[PDB]
UniProtKB/Swiss-Prot annotation, chains A, B, C:
Protein known as: 4-hydroxy-7-methoxy-3-oxo-3,4-dihydro-2H-1,4-benzoxazin-2-yl glucoside beta-D-glucosidase 1b, chloroplastic
Keywords on record: Chloroplast, Disulfide bond, Glycosidase, Hydrolase, Plastid, Transit peptide
Catalysed reactions, semicolon-separated: Hydrolysis of terminal, non-reducing beta-D-glucosyl residues with release of beta-D-glucose; DIMBOA beta-D-glucoside + H2O = DIMBOA + D-glucose; DIBOA beta-D-glucoside + H2O = DIBOA + D-glucose
Originating organism: Triticum aestivum (Wheat)
Disulfide cross-links: 199-205
Length: 491, 491, 491
């Protein structure tokens, strides 16, 4: 109550279930953990600005001014990884910390910071995987031309990426250009609950003077073009040794038909196309899914022949951020239905409950994460069978422990997160057993952090951040399981 | 709310899904519809007695004194069958109406009644299937020696069966010796909620001076012996033409493991053994399931070599009464668990909710019937693969519309029962497609009737009985669907 | 005659059929090869005592006083392994040689011996796998409190294990707490043909004053508790580096239903539960198989909550000792059958001949080993599908060349053993191909040894021991095949 059944002990994954090359790690993002939002010359990002001018748009009215203060305490992050025996760490680089004005002079203090983190990770036998952008846009560019709604963001992003390549490319060999593009577009320009908080007039978001049916697509189109330019540059001048890889990380939910009928089967396909295909298909074949173009038309920008070719095969590795799944319920095209939110264009509503009234799976804490590991295996098999089976990393996976939930009184006793993670690691094993080329699993939540519009009320970390005890890092039950799982020598 | 999703129109069964020989019908039982409990010489049954001396043990404090008064209105029952186009009608013969004293002089008025019903069914091109006993024991024998708890019931039942064979055998060619033996033993001698209402001292039933760990098995053992004797007699003297068939109808629930583990897989097997195997395995191989003997031991009577042989292969046709399914949760043998109810001997608790917290299926009205058609298909495939694939008839299948349920305001608008029935008829099609030898489907509920301890508060009929309008028969939406399904000529 | 068909040359396993990490080795046990039964302070074991006071209980009236004299000639054992190119050697440690009185002062001469063997194996690039106990109990403890029939054996064994851990744990990283627990209990306390030779009064064994229906279970229960204590200690203080593994080696026979019927299918499951589940299920879930508890009841000791948890998941690696298979024939529960031997509790007789009269497979020499490689593959797939697919090593596998068998005139020309081994190695390949996590194959019989109650009359070695030529080691045809198989450089 809420009845949460755990795996039988013999069904718990062991490290040897995966080969020696498989990689276990954890992930974080700059704004969610760094803090020092205006220290040593760092310029403001769209999230600094969003929180500072519309504080009420954050659940518990908190922000990322300090977060986990990883800007100063990064050594503790490295130690937590080491203690758990993680082989890889995926973190993001703050665009505004590197280039305070989005463009122009680079902030050497910013470059020094990341070089320290990188060298520390390497000193501790941990491989650094870098996310170039994680919703982290310089407010300078946002003020100048509307950030990602303007084509100028394409070359500006390219230059930013190049700064990262030349300064860290000698040690960092794996990159992700963008993180969760679909969620970013939906929340930042559709519902407007995320920075810059734009939506259509009449809707309830910070700044209701956008267009929920167009801005999300405009932003997504620029993201893809920026990605294409950065990768072309990378392949041309920053992979001389031939051992570097660059890709993108997509946020994806699994889908099951709401009701067993060919209609909901088709709806499920439209849902996958919209959630995953939106940004994956372009980097694979150089164009959006046919379903999206047929339903969105003029509101979805066309690619030029040159862009199409630039985008096709522009990923060496694919990142999949997976948390949950939904039932896909078919919506008919008729005068009775008129899209108002970009997500309406899929003509498939995402339902948490199936045709028999049952939830897709056990709730895990935060309202949107229902546990359904099968969904991940299915998505991985689609990557294999439909998209050429490219190298895939689960770049995000986990659950939140919510404040106020009395079934989670001890923040360190996260047996629920542990069971969830073990089940998804097992689901990845199933996919690998079926031929999917899955290369690693990065738990979302190296440490508790600023969970965007939900503030700190949601704890996603393997490692607790004691905000009342100087932001101390304290390993949770889940983290300790990893220590054992990874055979970390005992003190 | 309660969200009840209906089949898509193209998923609705058509009569031609089944071959020309397949049989669609409906069922009833003497005490549940006849009435005239003491008319024309009929003696009292254990249910007349149970209701008359412990009226409070019936939900709405009603009884079967008149029920649907089919004793007088049987012509209306025949007409309802005809109007729906049913090919078969399965009804039961009242032991106490035929032999008021259980033994001795036969009540000619009783014999005349059934001969009228039989001839009327034949006159209307409907084949009569007869259930010899349906919990319908003469209170005379109950008073004399404890009814089914005494071995004398074996020969008395045999003589009763013979009276039926010689008087109706020239026209009736298909028989079921007993109906729902497992439910009868569990409720009449375990929980004691059914006549004669016996249970262990300290338990809450009409007469708590029995033994819930022994009487159920004693009664079941006598039922099997009685069955064996009746069939031997039938095969020897009442099947001279070789075209008659006799079997038994078993009440069965489907089972799914509570949690995915070999332990609950084993628990599911024990549940099937206990619910279905208890009486099916003896008529198949001549002995109870091994699991039951290993867990019940001395409390489960042994069969003699002669009885074992008499029982083996004693069924020409199998009847399956299916309504719902449950999850089977494993219970360990230990000092912490001590059986008190016969059902505890299976060491597998029947759960309505799975390991993920979800109900097995949509509720349909009465509290114990959750919709799960897959369960029926699975049981039918077990009959095929494990028990020799004998001829099987779904002798009971349906749901109840409960009084007080405001989501069912019009008693004739039973679209929920219709959807449920269509789904189970489809499930039978699936089994047939997979090789199961299923010969027919009899809906439980030709008409609303006396639903034992729940009185008339539960309406299971395809045909409404207007108790306020002289017990008039009125076809419900479900019944009208059958008229179309069966291509009945229109007036 | 006996017609023994060999594999076609293209069906013979090649080393590259298995990956680089797969391990090929051979096994032995202290009492079967060491000799020097009372040298340098070693105290007597239950087998020294058994042979010395009941010499007639040994087939050819021989014993292990000297055996292969490996106490002095261990260098020759190491050389044989090297010559065959074996990567691993699994040997056992003599409890009585380490602690002459079972408890107390450690015999330094014993510790020095094993340190020499270990260092020699390492010097020759061979990894040592150690079996802590192989039926090898100190007669001191047997005299003091009845050995394994007394709970005191639990802590005494624990202390013995600790002595092994602290003295050899720096170089030995893989352990097996006990070997063939099922066979030990059945033969030592059921039939009593093995030391201490106990059985029920009226039976024919050395000391018929035990209880074949209880002592086997009492001994097995103490074995499991001892195992649990030793592993907990190991994990807590002797795996600081996280690279050590400890498990158990189970003797297991494959089973096929005697006749094709659900009854023999159920019997097969009971046979597997009894032979393999008896000790495997406790180390997996912390309790005996349900079938055993349901049939053995009070004669099978209960585990406490603490013990159950201590036992669950107490194995890092599983050892499977496989030689043959049998048909499982169902036995009904009835007054006509009363158990007298512990093995009777499975209600499934192990038959060498099937329902069609045919033997399960070709005889190989000794009367109990019929060749049936399919049985091993099936057991390995059960480990995978039912028990979580833990790391498995075939810790024993082979056949005997019997003295007096004129179809085996040249003891070095063991082409039959070679064919048998190649077929089982191929069977392991099949299991691996189907997903079973099999890590290695250890042939039973590094060299001919003392085969318990059959003395030296049975030769199980890959390497001949010329007892008439100073116990010289001479490679047989099988051994030479391994040299080629393993690509050992030629002289
Ligand atoms: C607010 O509800 C919600 C619904 C769907 C999704 C999100 C949020 O965000 C997810 O994206 C990740 O969320 C985690 C946990 O909040 C963040 O820490 C990560 O930075 C973010 O990528 C999800 O992708 N999206 O579907
Ligand atoms: C009272 O709850 C309950 C639970 C399980 C079962 C029954 C009742 O009775 C069922 O047997 C059939 O029930 C129908 C509907 O009440 C009657 O009209 C039939 O006469 C009876 O055979 C079911 O078999 N049993 O599992
Ligand atoms: C005596 O017949 C017999 C029947 C079954 C079994 C055994 C003997 O012993 C086996 O155990 C292994 O046997 C080999 C060969 O004799 C010994 O050298 C090993 O030490 C022993 O583990 C088998 O497990 N058992 O089923």
């Amino acid at each position: 109550g809420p009845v949460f059944t755990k795996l039988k002990p013999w069904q718990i994954p062991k490290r040897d279930w995966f080969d020696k090359d498989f990689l276990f790690g954890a992930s974080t993002s700059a704004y969610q953990i760094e803090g020092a939002w205006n220290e040593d010359g760092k310029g403001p990002s769209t999230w600094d600005h969003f929180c500072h001018t519309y504080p009420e748009r954050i659940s518990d009215m908190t922000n990322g001014d300090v977060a986990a203060n990883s800007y100063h305490l990064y050594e503790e992050d490295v130690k937590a990884l080491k203690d758990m025996g993680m082989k890889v760490y995926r973190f993001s680089i703050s665009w505004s910390r590197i280039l305070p004005d989005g463009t122009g002079k680079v902030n050497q203090a910013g470059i020094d910071y990341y070089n320290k983190l990188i060298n520390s990770l390497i000193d501790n036998d941990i491989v650094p995987y870098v996310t170039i952008w994680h919703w982290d846009t310089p407010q300078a560019l946002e003020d100048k031309y509307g950030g990602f709604l303007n084509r100028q963001i394409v070359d500006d992003y390219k230059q930013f990426a190049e700064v990262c390549f030349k300064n860290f490319g000698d040690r960092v060999k794996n990159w992700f250009t963008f993180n969760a593009p679909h969620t970013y577009c939906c929340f930042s320009y559709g519902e407007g609950i995320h920075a810059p908080g734009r939506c259509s007039p009449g809707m309830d978001c910070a700044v209701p003077e956008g267009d929920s049916l167009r801005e999300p697509y405009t932003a997504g189109h620029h993201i893809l073009l920026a990605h294409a330019e950065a990768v072309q540059l990378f392949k041309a001048r920053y992979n001389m040794h031939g051992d570097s890889k660059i890709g993108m990380a997509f946020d994806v939910m699994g889908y099951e038909p709401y009701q067993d009928s060919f209609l909901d089967d088709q709806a499920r396909e439209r849902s996958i196309d919209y959630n995953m295909g939106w940004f994956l298909e372009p980097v694979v074949r150089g164009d959006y899914p046919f379903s999206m173009r047929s339903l969105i038309g003029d509101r979805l920008p066309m690619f030029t022949k040159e862009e199409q070719e630039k985008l096709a095969s522009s990923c060496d590795i694919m990142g999949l951020n997976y948390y949950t799944s939904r039932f896909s319920k078919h919506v008919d095209m008729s005068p009775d239905f008129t899209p108002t939110l970009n997500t309406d264009d899929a003509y498939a509503s995402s339902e948490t409950t199936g045709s028999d009234g049952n939830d897709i799976g056990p709730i895990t804490g935060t309202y949107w994460i229902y546990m359904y590991p099968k969904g991940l295996t299915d998505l991985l098999l689609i990557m294999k069978e439909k998209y050429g089976n490219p190298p895939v990393f689960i770049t995000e996976n986990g659950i939140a422990d919510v404040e106020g939930d009395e079934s989670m009184p001890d923040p360190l006793d996260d047996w629920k997160r542990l069971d969830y993670l073990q089940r998804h690691i097992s689901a990845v094993k199933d996919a690998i057993d079926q031929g999917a080329d899955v290369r690693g699993h990065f738990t979302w939540g190296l440490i508790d952090n600023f969970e965007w519009s939900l503030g700190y009320s949601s704890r996603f970390g393997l490692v607790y951040i004691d905000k009342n005890d100087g932001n101390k890092r304290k390993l949770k039950k889940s983290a300790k399981w990893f220590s054992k799982f990874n055979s970390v020598p005992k003190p």
